[PDB]
């Protein structure tokens, strides 16, 4: 499986991968993170199709295989309309489950705030409703880092030497501590990371790296709006997640009846560290709200 095509959304060509499930019981749309990465690192969710869950993957504007629109359209709100236009173009009036990871999570929340009427359930993994809070929390993680790496981030970071050999070394430690904690990073993840460093979305919207959000979404925060979401919601976050469970908590407190699951020994990309347990939890939640 997985039909791969080029859907023309909002005037531009958007790449998507739809993996159908035999006796389909539901359609799950997924939102990769970054901003500026690609669907690739989310391919582990493809296992849910064996659970009767069709999964829709797709590269957001300017990401991966999709073309980049005008820079003025590098916004969360624009991504929201893109998602809705794509869901409509491919599924029409059918309601679907929406899953978002990291930035994709934040994008999913903003989507739900406006288009929750097109959803059956919402799933956020390592997502966030507030970038500022995410920054504040990540800084703490930096302070808990060993002296060298902590100073490297501050010195080189404040000067902008992200290319420095020491700074990089610090970034690596942090990553293997809050991004992905397991050995042998799967090719799907590497490709998404490579996709980020190549396109322009990550550098313009996000910033230098994972813990450095100096881009255009630096002030984004819809913590006050996500409380309007009245659909079944599943929130997951790794124990050592770069987007700490503290950020997940805020989201959890606003969405009435939402479930918060903190994966132990996992971090950001929990779908790879605990693939079986992750996919099982997501499929269980989905099938519970058919």
């Amino acid at each position: 499986e997985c039909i791969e095509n080029y859907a023309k959304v909002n005037g531009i060509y958007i790449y998507y991968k739809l993996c159908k499930a035999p006796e389909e019981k539901a359609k799950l749309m997924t939102m990769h993170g970054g901003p500026g990465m690609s669907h690739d690192y989310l391919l582990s969710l493809r296992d849910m199709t064996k659970e009767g869950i069709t999964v829709l993957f797709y590269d957001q504007f300017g990401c991966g295989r999709s073309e980049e629109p005008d820079q003025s359209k590098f916004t969360i709100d624009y991504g929201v309309e893109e998602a809705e236009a794509l869901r409509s173009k491919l599924f029409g009036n059918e309601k679907v489950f929406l899953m978002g990871s990291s930035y994709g999570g934040a994008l999913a929340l903003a989507y739900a705030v406006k288009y929750q009427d097109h959803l059956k359930g919402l799933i956020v993994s390592g997502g966030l409703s507030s970038v500022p809070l995410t920054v504040k929390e990540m800084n703490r993680l930096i302070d808990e880092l060993p002296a060298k790496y902590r100073d490297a981030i501050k010195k080189y970071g404040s000067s902008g030497s992200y290319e420095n050999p020491e700074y990089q070394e610090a970034v690596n430690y942090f990553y293997h501590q809050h991004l992905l904690r397991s050995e042998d990073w799967p090719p799907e993840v590497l490709k998404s990371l490579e996709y980020a460093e190549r396109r322009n979305v990550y550098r313009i919207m996000n910033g230098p790296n994972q813990f450095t959000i100096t881009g255009t979404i630096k002030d984004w925060d819809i913590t006050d709006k996500i409380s309007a979401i009245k659909i079944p919601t599943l929130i997951t976050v790794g124990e050592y997640d770069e987007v700490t469970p503290n950020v997940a908590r805020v989201i959890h407190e606003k969405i009435a009846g939402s479930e918060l699951h903190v994966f132990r020994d996992c971090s950001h990309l929990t779908m790879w560290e605990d693939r079986e347990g992750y996919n099982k939890l997501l499929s269980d939640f989905i099938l519970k709200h058919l």
Binding site: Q168, V171, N172, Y175, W185, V189, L190, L193, A196, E197, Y202, N206, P208, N209, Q210
Partner: peptide
């Protein structure tokens, strides 16, 4: 963002 990275890796190596």
């Amino acid at each position: 963002p990275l890796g190596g």
